[PDB]
Design a protein around this ligand. Sequence first.
Ligand SMILES: [Cl-]
Ligand SMILES: [Cl-]
Ligand SMILES: [Cl-]
Lengths: 260, 260, 263, 263, 262, 258
Amino acid sequence: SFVLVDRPRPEIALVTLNRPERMNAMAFDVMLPFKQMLVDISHDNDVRAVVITGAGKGFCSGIPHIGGLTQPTIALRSMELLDEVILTLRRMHQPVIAAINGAAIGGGLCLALACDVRVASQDAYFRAAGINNGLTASELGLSYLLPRAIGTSRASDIMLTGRDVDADEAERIGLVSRKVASESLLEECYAIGERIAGFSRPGIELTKRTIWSGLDAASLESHMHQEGLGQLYVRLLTDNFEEATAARKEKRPAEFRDKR
Amino acid sequence: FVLVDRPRPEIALVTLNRPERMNAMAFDVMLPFKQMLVDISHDNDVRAVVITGAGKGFCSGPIPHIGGLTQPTIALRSMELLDEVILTLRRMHQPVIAAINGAAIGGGLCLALACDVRVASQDAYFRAAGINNGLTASELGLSYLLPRAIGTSRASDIMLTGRDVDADEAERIGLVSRKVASESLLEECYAIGERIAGFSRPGIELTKRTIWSGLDAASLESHMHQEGLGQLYVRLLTDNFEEATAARKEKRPAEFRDKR
Amino acid sequence: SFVLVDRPRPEIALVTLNRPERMNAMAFDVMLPFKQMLVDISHDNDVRAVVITGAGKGFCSGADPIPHIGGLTQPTIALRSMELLDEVILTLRRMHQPVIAAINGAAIGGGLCLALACDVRVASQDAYFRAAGINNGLTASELGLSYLLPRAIGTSRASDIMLTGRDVDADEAERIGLVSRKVASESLLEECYAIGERIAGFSRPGIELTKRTIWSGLDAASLESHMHQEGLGQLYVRLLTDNFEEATAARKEKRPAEFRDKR
Amino acid sequence: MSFVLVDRPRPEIALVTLNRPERMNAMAFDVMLPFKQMLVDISHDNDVRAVVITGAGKGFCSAGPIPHIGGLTQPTIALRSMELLDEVILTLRRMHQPVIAAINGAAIGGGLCLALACDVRVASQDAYFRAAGINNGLTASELGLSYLLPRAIGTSRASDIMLTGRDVDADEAERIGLVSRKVASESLLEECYAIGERIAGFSRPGIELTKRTIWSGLDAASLESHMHQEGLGQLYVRLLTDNFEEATAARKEKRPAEFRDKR
Amino acid sequence: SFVLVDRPRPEIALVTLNRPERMNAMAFDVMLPFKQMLVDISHDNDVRAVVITGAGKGFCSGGPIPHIGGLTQPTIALRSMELLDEVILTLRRMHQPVIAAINGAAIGGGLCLALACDVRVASQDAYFRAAGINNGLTASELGLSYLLPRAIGTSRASDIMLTGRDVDADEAERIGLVSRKVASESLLEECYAIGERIAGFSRPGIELTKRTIWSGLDAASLESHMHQEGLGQLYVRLLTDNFEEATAARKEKRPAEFRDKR
Amino acid sequence: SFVLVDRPRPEIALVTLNRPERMNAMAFDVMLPFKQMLVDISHDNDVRAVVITGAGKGFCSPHIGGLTQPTIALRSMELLDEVILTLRRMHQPVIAAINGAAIGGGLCLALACDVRVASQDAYFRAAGINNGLTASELGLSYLLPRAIGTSRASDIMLTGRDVDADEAERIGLVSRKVASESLLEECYAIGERIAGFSRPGIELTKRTIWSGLDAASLESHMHQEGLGQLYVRLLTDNFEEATAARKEKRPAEFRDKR
Ligand SMILES: [Cl-]
Ligand SMILES: [Cl-]
Ligand SMILES: [Cl-]
């Protein structure tokens, strides 16, 4: 009921947050089947790319094993649960593309930023709603990931005012990389997914990982070691590069076998 | 030297006041300043701080505690006095908003980056003036913070060439998050501070703290622990969340008490 | 013959990647010597700024007899070949002088990485960028790209670019800050010489240390620690030159400053 | 018979026994897979305050079906196998309760890495350690070894051990701080339980946050950012429980503290 | 007066925590005259080295908070934690090296205080505990979980923090929580000998050594960090004739007399 | 001839600092090619492990046309910085055979080696402070706390005291302490152990260790370690050979290939 999965294209999974009346709020009865679904899809090798979207007008508007626990540990467990949604998205083998169909506020914004790629429809808007909710603006990666997406100036402004950021702004400042018509939003994300599906699987998987490890790295030279090894790993253990050369000489798109 | 006003009951306005010399860095304009910042930080009537310069510029004399010292150490002390200004702004409880009314060059550009939010007048401009002055372009956090605000390609060009950056370009590239008409600059800044003041006190404090801490962090996962803890702190120790829900339901302004 | 070195302006070296027929893809047997040329220019004190551009229509496509390979098995030889490219990137960074990428055409794969290794990036109207590793069936990330691209253009744009293997045209490159400037093809070298001459007009140690603090600031964990390095450099040039007194005099009189970099 | 046993030797202490002694408790996927699910399950088990891990038989820890590989090729399959082991290290790290490694014998290769992923390390006199990835013809580094060994014992000692693939006996391990405690073989479990009992009598959130700050302290770049996390955690427990007043009343009354983690 | 300041040698300040009937606890009454006094000392150019110690039996264990008009409970708690954080950070920031003369119990905040100092010397009577954990809280506070593993390694720090055990002076010296242990009646004398050595060296030389050590803990990259160290070395070498003076003092059979100038 | 190179065992290069009269001091003119000697060894595939020592009692104590003194001084610091970074970057492990005084830059040089071994007569000092400068250069303030911990590093650097061989071993500044007559023998045995192991195996080990110092995320660094581990595992038959060698009670002879 609360989370839907579809296969709109043969290698592309679409995950729908489905509690439209609550704008797909990050309640636990949503976020728990959400997390498990992500784990299942990471393990499913027919899937090369994943799109996330909200049912209805919003994208996302942001407990078990609690026997014997007091309220303060329980709250710790509840936040940990949401933290794990964020880290699970980042750890998935496949790139995750956020199809931001509407409001993406508070934790919904953090959810977008936990994806690899972000696409806005004309109707998407964003807010750091933690601050409007009388708490902090910062939760679930937001104070880490927002400035790395759009820079300090724009991130501070957004986090300290709790103002609305519309689709035009979002694309202008690089909060999303694309902005499209509402009724083409998913189609655009599928088109992204399909380009990804035609690339090397380990090639793609290591690319996603080096980007995230790249945020968590503070030496160029150290990080370059990880990047190089993955390039050589795929080069030596597949015939992909010979195949891309052979395809481009025979004026043809490449078909990658990911093995010798 | 430095004037302070209360143009709204929870907004302190700090006016750098040596207009004849473009409100320049001065080891007698600078250290008074530091203690004024400290006092404003301890001043619980103040929720937001606005800094601007008198006259047309924004920001471009005995080093105290000097007896017994020699030239090399004296010079370390004087640079340290400036480094502490940068660091004191970052440490203040309240967000600091730069109302950039005119030239911000050298240390003046550094000051503005030490502020949380940057708002440009159409008449504002920026320069990495250390380089035009026969020195390096880098000081006072500039080579750390500028690239994190506007990205490397743009940061390097501005710092290596020592060119002037006008208001249009500053706003376009994310050096400031807003550009407005000269006559509306302070009022735009008052409206921002008033929003901040309408939000949770510890909410805001911890938000500002997580943003700065976020630049000084190199692990997504470590940083999330700090954000989450602050979020739960305010959630559990206040009734703020319920008050935001009640005010939203009753179409009225939130009045956060920051207590249960 | 694989790269040309010219001196178009008195204190500016132009390095022209010269395999036009292969869009300036560089050979593994050119790599050790190419790094020696950069090294030599670093130690050429006539040179205050370096411009790198492509011969023919392309800028650089990166990948194409690896030296010091005797007795090695294939897997090690491959690590050695990746290291040679790594070290080219690091050498640019390490050069005393700022390096300006005059991007005249396609900068793809290793060529995008090369531009990112340079301090300043200027695009011709004809320039394009692509993370071609992914199009070539490998990963998109090599040679610092996964580290340096988000630091240029932020994560949203970088992840899109790297994962979809699309082309970024000159317009989009300036807009998103992959390059700082975009000019007509016939003005590209001229724009870069003008930037180079500004730089030559500044203090040599002032410039050298600016460049080093920039790269050092990316490899830095703490605002406070990094300030220590910056401040030390600023005091170093201030106390060991009268450059600062010269800049004040030069503005009083309305003449260009002429820094002596000594007292 | 199952490759991983769990017991409850003391009311709030889980004992995890790696239980394929015929292979010195090697990290074949038959052992590790049910290892990881049991760890997760224990983390969700609120009866348990501390976890102890040991090896059955002579060894502490020294291949089988890789799951979810349908439609996958060799190189990707190898990626999955390595991730599976990585996830083990990260799960131990991420568990609510402190883990105590009761090292009763050989901890070599992945087994040394396993010990390093625990919070506390106690050696039997019979314990010994080896970075056996190197002796196996590979690198010495995997599963965090090259990150964590030097954080445990310093670079000098780590490099020596990793590059030479020598045995480090119990006397050395305790002396250099690879383990914090060394005890007779017959007292090993007893020593670990006493540790686990001290832990159980401390605050639950207090302990959980301590473990988390220690681990995130090592993934931290700034003393000052780290203190923010630490202080938040301290204020959290202080303001939301009466533990601190309990601690005061307990010392004034000369009794064990009895923390209720609540007001 | 909850803090005493003495001048036991002409270039050495001694700071005594002076509430022995409470084992010198980190009450705000103590911690206020602390930070401002340390800042004062930092600006006193007669002082080349600082020693900190506790009156009576203990070193330091774990009163209106100022500036809290109109704050609520949780914000006042933030303010009080910040006060303590800023003491840690001030010690780090002082020009002169701070030597902890640890004469007794150094538990919780008092252990954290010792880690905030550059050099730690234990009396034979000294002992350490991460007492936040014994107090029903976390063991981690005031830099502890950052600085303990960097002093002694993870294995040892984890054990100590999770068990709330007492760490005697023999252990503290063995595991490098302190670099020295001496007889209790010789404690201050040992730290004074350390301070006089410090005093005999370059002032910039010593100031930049301390700063690079602290910054190096907050550094991500060796190569980055080397740029800071090299600049400081070149700065002192080129702005003083100290290096020539150390060469000449050796030859001429006379002590080095560094005047920090040419 | 301020640098000697020998080959005391078949895959082992000995680099002997050879200016004993000056206790093997940093000479500016005789290190701009000493970096090149290391670069030549690094690219010599006959050599598996490098041992560095000093002649005599001690271990260890251009292009400026048109430059001014401040910049010449930056150039001069750079060349010494380049020596530190070069050791770190060599393909092969570098073993410091510390036979005597290792003071100042001589201590930093030792810290830039992978493995440190002290003679009983070896001693150490952060001599920049005794020289009226700072104690910190060439990595010292970064690498010394990561070898011996903060407490001990700060004491050593701020006091400029002597650290004898006994203390060096006890605190982990060196990992081994031997009799003077046995120093080079101990380092050769270690070198030949290294030579017996996989070449890419060894090279990636060194790199991960150095890189691991310049990492601030466990999870990040684990990606690098695993990739390198898988790379050698699938691209060679070493693992299968180790297995076979044990079972046949013979030494392993790794081919670094399938
Ligand atoms: Cl639309
Ligand atoms: Cl054109
Ligand atoms: Cl001997």
